[PDB]
C-alpha cells in the first residue's frame, strides 16, 4: 500500500500532463497520494476527482485519441508560452489544442468505446478566448459549441468571450472537465471549435 508521491506537482498538473511533471506516473496502484495549471482556468469537480483518485488498484495511461487520424483537417500542433518547458513553448501531455487548418475549422466528431474492462478517466478542456477577433482567428466560427455525451454524462458548452485579469501572462482561460466511463459505455465528442481534445486517458479500478 505504498503511496503515490507527486513531488513538486499537484494532482491537477499530474492528471492533465503538465510539461513540468514528465518524470512521474511510477505506479499501477496506491492507497493514498502525497503532493498546478499551466494555462489558467477553472477545474470543475476537482476535489471530487482527488477523492476518486485517492486509492486505485489497476492504474494505466493509454492514448485515447492518437495525435494523428483522430482529428483530420484540424491543426494539432498548438503550444503556448504559458506551458513552457525547457524554455520551449509546449502544452499538456494528455490534451490537444485543436485549431483551424487551411483557414477552416469544420464541424468535428469522434467517439471512443470503453473495452478495457475497467473505469476510464477521460479529461478535456474548453477554451475561452478573450476577444471575439481571436475567436474567429482560431476557430473560424463566431458562436461555438462543444458536445460531450456518454451513457451517464451529457453536457453542451457554449463558450463566450470576456476580458479577464492577467494571470500567468494570459488573460483567457481554459476550463477543465472530466467524466468516468463505465465498461462497455461510449463517449462522443462534438465541436466546431474551442475544444481542448483528449489525447491520453486513464484506465483504473476501485475508484
Amino acid at each position, epitope marked *: 500500500s505504498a503511496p503515490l508521491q507527486l513531488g513538486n506537482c499537484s494532482v491537477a498538473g499530474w492528471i492533465l500532463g503538465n510539461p513540468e511533471c514528465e518524470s512521474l506516473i511510477s505506479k499501477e496502484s496506491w492507497s493514498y497520494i502525497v503532493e498546478g495549471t499551466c494555462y489558467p482556468g477553472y477545474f470543475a469537480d476537482y476535489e471530487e476527482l482527488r477523492e476518486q483518485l485517492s486509492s486505485v488498484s489497476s492504474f494505466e495511461r493509454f492514448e485515447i485519441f492518437p495525435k494523428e487520424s483522430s482529428w483530420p483537417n484540424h491543426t494539432v500542433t498548438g*503550444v503556448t508560452a504559458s506551458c513552457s518547458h525547457n524554455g520551449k513553448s509546449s502544452f499538456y501531455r494528455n490534451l490537444l489544442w485543436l485549431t483551424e487548418k487551411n483557414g477552416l475549422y469544420p464541424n468535428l466528431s469522434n467517439s471512443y468505446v470503453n473495452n478495457k474492462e475497467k473505469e476510464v478517466l477521460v479529461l478535456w478542456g474548453v477554451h475561452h478566448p478573450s476577444n471575439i477577433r481571436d475567436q474567429r482567428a482560431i476557430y473560424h466560427t463566431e458562436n461555438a459549441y462543444v458536445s460531450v455525451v456518454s451513457s451517464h454524462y451529457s453536457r453542451r458548452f457554449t463558450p463566450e468571450i470576456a476580458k479577464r485579469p492577467k494571470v500567468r501572462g494570459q488573460e483567457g482561460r481554459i476550463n477543465y472537465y472530466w467524466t468516468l466511463l463505465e465498461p462497455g459505455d461510449t463517449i462522443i465528442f462534438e465541436a466546431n471549435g474551442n475544444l481542448i481534445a483528449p489525447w491520453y486517458a486513464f484506465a483504473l479500478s476501485r475508484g
Partner: antibody
Framework: QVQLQESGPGLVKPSGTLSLTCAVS?????????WSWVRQPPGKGLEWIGE???????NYNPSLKSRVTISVDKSKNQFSLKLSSVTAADTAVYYC???????????????????????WGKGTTVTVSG | SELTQDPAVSVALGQTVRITCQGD??????ASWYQQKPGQAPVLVIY???NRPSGIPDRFSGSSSGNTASLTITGAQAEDEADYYC????????????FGGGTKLTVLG
C-alpha cells in the same frame, strides 16, 4: 494548394480610379485568412497597401487610407482593390497575396503570432498615364 | 513604427552573411523574410522563428533578439544574389504591416 489569379487594366488615366481583381482557387474566400495587396514602384521597395477579412473588416496603410478601398465578393470567390485619385506616384507593380490569421491577445497558440505572405499573385503592371 | 535595413551587403561564395533588420515592431509579432530577383515576384524564405517553407534550403536561417531580426545565409552561392526584405506586423493600434527598406545582396567571386 491555393493560388491567386490577378486581373485588371494596365493603364489608368490621371485622377482616375485603379481597379484590380484577385481570384481565389483551391479554397474559399470565406476562410480565416487576411487577403492583402502589395505594390512596388519602379526601382523602389515593397509597400503594404491593406488587407481584408472575409467578414468585412478592413485595415489599410495610414498613408493611403484616403484613397484605398478593398472589398470582397463571396459570390465569385474574389477580392478587389480600388485606388482613387491616381498620380505618377501610383505607377507600380501590384500584387495580391494571402496572410494567415493572427491574434491581438495572448490567448492563442504561438503559430498565430506570425506575419507572412506565402501565396502571391503573379503581378499586374499598372501605369498612370494619359 | 518602421523597419530599417542596410541597402546593400556583399558576401563571398561559400561563406556566411547576416542581413539585419531593426525595428520596434519586431518584439510583438514574428518577422518574415522574402527573396526577390529582378523581374520576378517575391518568394517567402523565412517566417516565424526559423521556419522555412517547403522549397527553401537549410542554408537560410532566421533569428530575433530584442528589436532586431536577422537573416543568415550559410555557404552563400551565386543563386542567392537578390534583394531581401524583412516584414512584420506592428503590435499596437490597427496593427499595420510594414516592409523593410530591402537589402541588395551581392555574391562576390
Amino acid at each position: 494548394q491555393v493560388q491567386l489569379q490577378e486581373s485588371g487594366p494596365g493603364l489608368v488615366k490621371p485622377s482616375g480610379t485603379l481597379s484590380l481583381t484577385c481570384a481565389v482557387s483551391g479554397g474559399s474566400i470565406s476562410s480565416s485568412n487576411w487577403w492583402s495587396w502589395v505594390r512596388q514602384p519602379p526601382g523602389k521597395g515593397l509597400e503594404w497597401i491593406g488587407e481584408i477579412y472575409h467578414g468585412g473588416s478592413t485595415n489599410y496603410n495610414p498613408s493611403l487610407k484616403s484613397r484605398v478601398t478593398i472589398s470582397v465578393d463571396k459570390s465569385k470567390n474574389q477580392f478587389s482593390l480600388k485606388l482613387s485619385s491616381v498620380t505618377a506616384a501610383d505607377t507600380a507593380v501590384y500584387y495580391c497575396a494571402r496572410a494567415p490569421p493572427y491574434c491581438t491577445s495572448a490567448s492563442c497558440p504561438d503559430d498565430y503570432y506570425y506575419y507572412y505572405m506565402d501565396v502571391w499573385g503573379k503581378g499586374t503592371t499598372v501605369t498612370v498615364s494619359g | 513604427s518602421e523597419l530599417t535595413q542596410d541597402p546593400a551587403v556583399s558576401v563571398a561564395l561559400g561563406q556566411t552573411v547576416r542581413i539585419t533588420c531593426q525595428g520596434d515592431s519586431l518584439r510583438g509579432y514574428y518577422a518574415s523574410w522574402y527573396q526577390q530577383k529582378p523581374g520576378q515576384a517575391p518568394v517567402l524564405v523565412i517566417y516565424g522563428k526559423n521556419n522555412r517553407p517547403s522549397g527553401i534550403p537549410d542554408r537560410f536561417s532566421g533569428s530575433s533578439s530584442g528589436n532586431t531580426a536577422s537573416l543568415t545565409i550559410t555557404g552563400a552561392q551565386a543563386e542567392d544574389e537578390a534583394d531581401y526584405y524583412c516584414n512584420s506586423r506592428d503590435s499596437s493600434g490597427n496593427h499595420p504591416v510594414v516592409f523593410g527598406g530591402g537589402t541588395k545582396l551581392t555574391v562576390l567571386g
